[PDB]
Amino acid sequence: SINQKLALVIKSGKYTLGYKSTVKSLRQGKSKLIIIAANTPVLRKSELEYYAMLSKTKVYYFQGGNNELGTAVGKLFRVGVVSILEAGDSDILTTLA
Amino acid sequence: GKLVIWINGDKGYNGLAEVGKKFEKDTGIKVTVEHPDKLEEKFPQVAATGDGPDIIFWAHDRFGGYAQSGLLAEITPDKAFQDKLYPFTWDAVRYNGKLIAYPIAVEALSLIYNKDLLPNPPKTWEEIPALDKELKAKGKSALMFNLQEPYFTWPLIAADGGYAFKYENGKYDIKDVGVDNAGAKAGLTFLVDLIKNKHMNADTDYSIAEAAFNKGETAMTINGPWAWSNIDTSKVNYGVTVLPTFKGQPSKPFVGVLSAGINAASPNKELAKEFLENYLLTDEGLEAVNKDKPLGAVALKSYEEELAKDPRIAATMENAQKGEIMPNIPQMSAFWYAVRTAVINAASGRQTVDEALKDAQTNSS
RNA sequence: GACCGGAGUGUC
RNA sequence: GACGCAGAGAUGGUC
Ligand SMILES: OC[C@H]1O[C@H](O[C@H]2[C@H](O)[C@@H](O)[C@@H](O[C@H]3[C@H](O)[C@@H](O)[C@@H](O[C@H]4[C@H](O)[C@@H](O)[C@@H](O)O[C@@H]4CO)O[C@@H]3CO)O[C@@H]2CO)[C@H](O)[C@@H](O)[C@@H]1O
Numbered sequence: 384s385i386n387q388k389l390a391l392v393i394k395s396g397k398y399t400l401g402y403k404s405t406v407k408s409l410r411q412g413k414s415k416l417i418i419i420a421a422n423t424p425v426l427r428k429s430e431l432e433y434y435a436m437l438s439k440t441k442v443y444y445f446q447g448g449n450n451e452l453g454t455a456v457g458k459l460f461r462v463g464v465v466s467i468l469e470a471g472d473s474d475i476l477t478t479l480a
Numbered sequence: 481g482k483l484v485i486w487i488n489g490d491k492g493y494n495g496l497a498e499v500g501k502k503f504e505k506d507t508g509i510k511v512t513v514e515h516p517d518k519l520e521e522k523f524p525q526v527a528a529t530g531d532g533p534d535i536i537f538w539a540h541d542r543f544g545g546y547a548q549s550g551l552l553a554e555i556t557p558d559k560a561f562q563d564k565l566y567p568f569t570w571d572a573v574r575y576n577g578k579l580i581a582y583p584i585a586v587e588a589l590s591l592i593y594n595k596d597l598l599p600n601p602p603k604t605w606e607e608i609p610a611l612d613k614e615l616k617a618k619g620k621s622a623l624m625f626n627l628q629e630p631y632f633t634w635p636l637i638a639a640d641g642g643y644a645f646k647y648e649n650g651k652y653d654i655k656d657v658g659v660d661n662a663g664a665k666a667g668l669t670f671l672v673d674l675i676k677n678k679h680m681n682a683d684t685d686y687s688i689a690e691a692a693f694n695k696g697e698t699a700m701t702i703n704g705p706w707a708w709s710n711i712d713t714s715k716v717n718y719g720v721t722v723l724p725t726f727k728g729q730p731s732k733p734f735v736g737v738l739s740a741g742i743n744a745a746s747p748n749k750e751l752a753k754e755f756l757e758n759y760l761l762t763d764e765g766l767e768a769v770n771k772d773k774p775l776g777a778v779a780l781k782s783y784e785e786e787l788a789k790d791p792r793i794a795a796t797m798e799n800a801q802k803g804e805i806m807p808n809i810p811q812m813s814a815f816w817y818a819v820r821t822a823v824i825n826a827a828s829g830r831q832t833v834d835e836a837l838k839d840a841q842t843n844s845s
Numbered sequence: 846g847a848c849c850g851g852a853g854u855g856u857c
Numbered sequence: 858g859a860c861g862c863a864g865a866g867a868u869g870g871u872c
Contacts, residue, residue, distance in 0.1 A: 399851095399864090400851095400864050400866095401851085401864025401865080401866055402864065402865055402866075403850095403851085403864070403865090403866055404851075404864070404866080405864090421530055421745060421747070422747055423865075424865070427865065428530075432529075444528065444529060444530045444745075446550075446744070446745060449864090449865080453864090458852095458864085460852085460853090460863070460864070460867095461863095461864080461865085462864055462865095463864075463865055464864080464865085
């Protein structure tokens with residue numbers, strides 16, 4: 384169901400995709416919620432969880448590899464992490480997180 | 481491409497590992513068996529972060545709570561497999577009509593006693609106070625068992641009518657809780673009575689109670705099949721019989737069903753099925769686990785037929801039948817933690833029986 | 846090599 | 858249009 388919630392945030396509000404881009408968003412505290420794919424390597428989900436921890440940002444764990452994330456965010460390529468900035472008509476930061 | 485299994489510390493975890501070796505020698509898949517403390521408490525917290533295991537083992541009760549949180553994989557065994565295991569054992573592992581784990585065994589507490597200190601075991605709880613004074617002359621206790629987990633004192637509190645949740649037309653009424661009823665009080669009182677009348681210390685736990693029976697220091701204990709192997713090795717002449725009746729009624733142990741659910745988030749769910757279905761749930765697997773620590777009444781018909789003659793399993797089957805099957809709903813957790821504190825506080829002194837149970841009556845919902 | 850940069854882009 | 862790289866940062870830039 385959340386796959387629709389993600390898509391929604393993408394038409395009205397801003398988001399960002401990829402590792403590099405989200406860590407930056409965590410440093411800036413501009414992202415509210417982050418989303419990391421299931422079978423993401425360890426160093427990396429540790430390093431994300433770590434900035435999310437320092438940034439005091441929430442984390443949602445997607446029940447499906449980056450492959451389905453890209454599909455869920457309107458892309459063709461794989462995306463192991465999604466930084467949600469502001470959500471328009473969507474409620475993922477106020478319902479599930 | 482591996483399978484990480486979490487099984488409880490008082491089970492055949494070395495023997496489950498032994499089943500993992502065959503799985504390695506026949507595909508090269510790493511079967512890692514661990515037995516972490518408070519695993520049933522950990523699995524929900526660690527699967528919400530995606531760091532949990534692939535296969536988790538526990539009695540059917542903690543599985544409904546997981547299923548309601550989507551932490552368990554919808555298991556998909558074929559029609560032929562389902563008819564290999566008892567139709568009742570699958571019911572224990574069913575949440576919202578969907579099968580969430582594989583049944584492995586039916587567990588039930590029984591009266592374990594020392595034939596050398598007691599040829600004819602008590603038929604009722606009401607005679608234990610006397611039998612204790614009699615053994616205090618020979619410098620030995622009569623009954624020693626773990627009073628820290630409510631599961632062991634429940635056969636007594638349930639005996640005279642105590643219950644968890646009222647069962648009605650299939651659904652469990654989460655608002656009707658039988659921990660405060662007149663019957664429940666009586667049984668919990670009786671426990672607190674032997675405690676107050678110096679027949680059973682209120683600080684005794686699993687480690688203590690097991691130690692006393694196994695070192696010949698007490699006539700009887702209340703335990704499950706798992707504790708047999710360690711008793712067998714103490715070289716104590718022992719038997720496994722029906723639980724004593726309290727108030728002319730049978731004790732109603734909460735029957736568990738050692739299930740093995742799959743982590744919904746696990747990447748190796750496909751490998752879990754091959755392992756659990758064609759390497760564990762077979763006369764070969766259960767045997768290797770049962771040789772480490774007995775399962776007793778087994779979910780798999782094949783191996784069960786073999787073990788049936790054992791008079792120890794006869795008792796288990798007896799008690800399992802005389803008692804009630806544990807509900808699998810998510811609210812079980814609350815009722816347990818709630819009754820946990822009642823039996824302790826009641827026996828310690830903090831709260832009186834009526835007070836302890838009156839509080840569990842509320843904390844349970 | 847380090848940094849910048851954020852969706853494409855190299856081949857036949 | 859298939860392959861190859863490419864948000865787990867591609868090609869591309871600048872020192
Ligand atoms: O309060 C702190 C304590 O918390 C923990 O104890 C809890 C369990 O986590 C709950 O799950 C529950 O316990 C039930 C258990 O769920 C149920 O399956 C049954 O378990 C038996 C089971 O038949 C069998 O597999 C065998 O291994 O033993 C189990 C009993 O030990 O009954 C349990 C009730 O005791 O509630 C308890 C607390 O009441 C934690 O594990 C404790 O260490 C901690 O102190």
